[PDB]
Design a protein around this ligand. Structure first.
Ligand code: HEM
Ligand code: HEM
Ligand code: HEM
Ligand code: HEM
Lengths: 146, 142, 146, 142
C-alpha cells in the first residue's frame, strides 16, 4: 500500500492547519537537545552547549521553519516524492554531509511536537498517516547517498 | 546510564502523570497495534486485537504497572525488573526491537496528554530511562 | 538503483555454488543460539534449551534447508520479488505469526555463515550485493502484514 | 551485561585473533564504507574514502586498538571507554546507530578470517560484548 484517500485527506488536513512558526523551531530545537549528535551541522549558529541557549537561538528557530517548509513539496506531489526530493537528497549528501539517520530522528521530533499541538486530535489513525508520510520523505532524502 | 539529573527528572514527571497510567497504557498500546501492525504477532491468542479492546485496555494497565515498578527501582533496573525479564525471555519470547517501538508510542501519548510538562529536558531523561527499561527487560534473554 | 548486471552476476554465482545442506542448518542453528527469541516458533522441534541440543537437532537442520531454498524463487525472479513472496508473506503473518524482525536476524546469520564458507572470496563487493538481495526478500516477506 | 562465560569467551577469542587486529580493522572499515555508503559522511575530511586506502588502513588500526582496550577493560566498559566516549560525543558527533553497522562488519570479517574459532558460542558472547562497547561509547552523548 501507497496512498488511500483517507491518508490523502489527513495529510492535507494536517498541512492546511500547520503553524510553521510554532512547530518548526520547536521540532529542530527538540532534536538538537534529545539527539545532540545532530549539532554537527550547526557550527557558527552560536552557542548550543546548553538546552536554554538552544531554545533561544534565532538561527535554530529560522532553520527549523526552513526544514518544516521543505515538506510542502512532498505534500503537493504525493505520488512523486522520490523524484521531487532527489535534489535535496544530493545536497544533504555531497555538500552538507549529513548522516541520513538524522532525517529519521528529526521526523520523530516533528511527530512529538505536532502531537503536543493537536492533543486528542492526534489519533492513532492520524499518527499512522503522518508517520507514513514522513517515512516516505526520509526514504527519498537518503536515496542519492553513494 | 541515568544521571542523578535524569533520575530527578523522571521521578518528578512520574509524580505528575503517574495518576493517568492506565489511560496512557491503553492509548500507547492502541497506537502500537495500529501504527505498527507487525507487533500484532504477539497477541494472536486474543480475538480482539483492536484499539481500546477490553484486552488492550487491561494489558495497557499491566504494562504501565511495570513502568511504575521501574520508576521505583530506578536505581537498579537490572535487578528490579528481573522477573519481568524472565517472563519476556522464556515465556513470551518478545524480540526486544519491539521495546523501542512501544517506547516511541509512550512518548507520543505523554506528549498528547501533558504538553506543558513534556519539555525537551524531560524528554531527554525519559528517553534515556525507557531505553534503560528496554535493556533491563532484555537482560535474561541470552 | 535496482539491479546492475554485476549484482545479477554475483547473485547468480553465489547461488549456483550454494551448499544448502551445509549453510542451511548452520544459519538457522546459529540464529537460535544468537537470537533465542526466534525459538518462539519451534516447540515440537525437540529440545533447544542449550547450544549443543540445537546444533544437533535434525528438525532444525531440515528447516534450515527449507528456508534457504526459499530464496531460490527470488533468484529466478529478480525483477519481481514482492509479487513472488506475497504468498509466503501471508503465510508467516497469518498462520505462523512470525515477528518480521526475525527475518532480518536470520539474514545476518545467513550472511555470517556464507562469509565463513567463502572466506576471502566474500569480498566487500559480494557482501554488498548479497545483503541487497536479502534485504529485498525481507522487505517482501514483511509486506503482507496488516 | 556480560556474564563470566561471556568475558572468558571474548578473552579467549581475542587471545587467538588479537595479532591480526590491524588486518581486521582495515577489512571491516572497507566493508562499512562500501556496504553502507551513508557512513562516508563522517570521512568527508579525507580525499580517499576508498576501500583499503592509506587513511582507511590507518583508522582501521585505531578502531581495532579501541576494541583491544575494551577487551582489557571488559569488567567496566563504561569507565574504561570514558575518554573515547567524549571524543565521539563532543568532537565527532557520531550517530550511535553507526556503531551497530560497524559491529556487524566486524563479525563478518572475523567470520571470514577465523571460521573455526567463530563458533555460535563465541558469536553470542562477542555480539553481547560489541553491543556493550556500543553502549559504553554512547555514555557521554546526553
Ligand atoms: C525531514 C528531514 C529534512 C528535510 C525535509 C530538510 C530540508 C532542507 C531543505 C529544503 C534545505 C534547503 C536549503 C537550500 O536550498 O540551501 C535544507 C538545508 C539544510 N539542512 Fe536539511 N532537512 C532535513 C533534515 C535535516 C537534518 C536532520 C539536518 C541536521 C542534522 C539538516 C541540516 C541542514 C543544513 C545544515 C542545511 C543548510 C542550511 C544553510 O543553508 O545554512 N537537515 N534542509
Ligand atoms: C515498556 C516495555 C514493557 C513492559 C514494562 C512490559 C510489561 C509487561 C508486564 C508487566 C506483563 C505481565 C502482566 C501480568 O503480570 O500478567 C507483560 C505481558 C506481556 N507483554 Fe510485555 N511489557 C513491555 C513491552 C512489551 C512489548 C513491546 C511486547 C510485544 C510486542 C510485549 C508483549 C507482552 C505479552 C504478549 C504479554 C502477555 C500478555 C497476555 O497474554 O496477557 N511486552 N508485559
Ligand atoms: C529469509 C527468511 C525466511 C524465508 C525465505 C523463509 C522461508 C520459508 C518457506 C519457503 C516456508 C515454506 C513452508 C511451506 O510452504 O509449508 C517456511 C515455513 C516456515 N517458516 Fe519461514 N522463512 C524465513 C524466515 C523464518 C523465520 C525467521 C522464522 C521464525 C523466526 C520462520 C518460521 C517458519 C515456520 C515455523 C514455518 C512452518 C514450517 C512447518 O512446520 O512446516 N521462517 N519458511
Ligand atoms: C567499534 C566502535 C568504534 C571504536 C572502538 C572507535 C574508536 C575510535 C578511536 C580510538 C578513534 C581516535 C584516535 C585518535 O585520533 O585519538 C576514533 C576516531 C574516529 N572515529 Fe571512531 N570508533 C568506533 C566507531 C566509529 C564509527 C561507527 C564511526 C562512523 C562511521 C566512527 C568515526 C570516527 C571518526 C570520524 C574518527 C576520527 C578519525 C580521523 O579523523 O582520522 N567511529 N574512533
Amino acid at each position: 500500500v501507497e496512498w488511500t484517500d483517507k491518508e490523502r485527506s489527513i495529510i492535507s488536513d494536517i498541512f492546511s492547519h500547520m503553524d510553521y512558526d510554532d512547530i518548526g523551531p520547536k521540532a529542530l530545537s527538540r532534536c538538537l537537545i534529545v539527539y545532540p549528535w545532530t549539532q554537527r551541522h550547526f557550527s557558527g549558529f552560536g552557542n548550543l552547549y546548553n538546552a536554554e541557549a538552544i531554545i533561544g537561538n534565532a538561527n535554530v528557530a529560522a532553520h527549523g521553519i526552513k526544514v518544516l517548509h521543505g515538506l510542502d513539496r512532498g505534500v503537493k506531489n504525493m505520488d512523486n516524492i522520490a523524484a521531487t526530493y532527489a535534489d535535496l537528497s544530493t545536497l544533504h549528501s555531497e555538500k552538507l554531509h549529513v548522516d541520513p539517520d538524522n532525517f529519521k530522528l528529526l521526523s520523530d521530533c516533528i511527530t512529538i511536537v505536532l502531537a503536543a499541538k493537536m492533543g486528542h486530535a492526534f489519533t492513532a489513525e492520524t499518527q499512522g498517516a503522518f508517520q507514513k508520510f514522513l517515512a516516505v520523505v526520509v526514504s527519498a532524502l537518503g536515496k542519492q547517498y553513494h | 546510564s541515568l544521571s542523578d539529573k535524569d533520575k530527578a527528572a523522571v521521578r518528578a514527571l512520574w509524580s505528575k502523570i503517574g495518576k493517568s497510567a492506565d489511560a496512557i497504557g491503553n492509548d500507547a498500546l492502541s497506537r502500537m497495534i495500529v501504527v505498527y501492525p507487525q507487533t500484532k504477532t504477539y497477541f494472536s491468542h486474543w480475538p480482539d486485537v483492536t484499539p481500546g479492546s477490553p484486552h488492550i485496555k487491561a494489558h495497557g494497565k499491566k504494562v504501565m504497572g511495570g513502568i511504575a515498578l521501574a520508576v521505583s527501582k530506578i536505581d537498579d533496573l537490572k535487578t528490579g525488573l528481573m522477573e519481568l525479564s524472565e517472563q519476556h525471555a522464556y515465556k513470551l519470547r518478545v524480540d526486544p526491537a519491539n521495546f523501542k517501538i512501544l517506547n516511541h508510542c509512550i512518548l507520543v501519548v505523554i506528549s498528547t496528554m501533558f504538553p506543558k510538562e513534556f519539555t525537551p529536558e524531560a524528554h531527554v531523561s525519559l528517553d534515556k530511562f525507557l531505553s534503560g527499561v528496554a535493556l533491563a527487560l532484555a537482560e535474561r534473554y541470552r
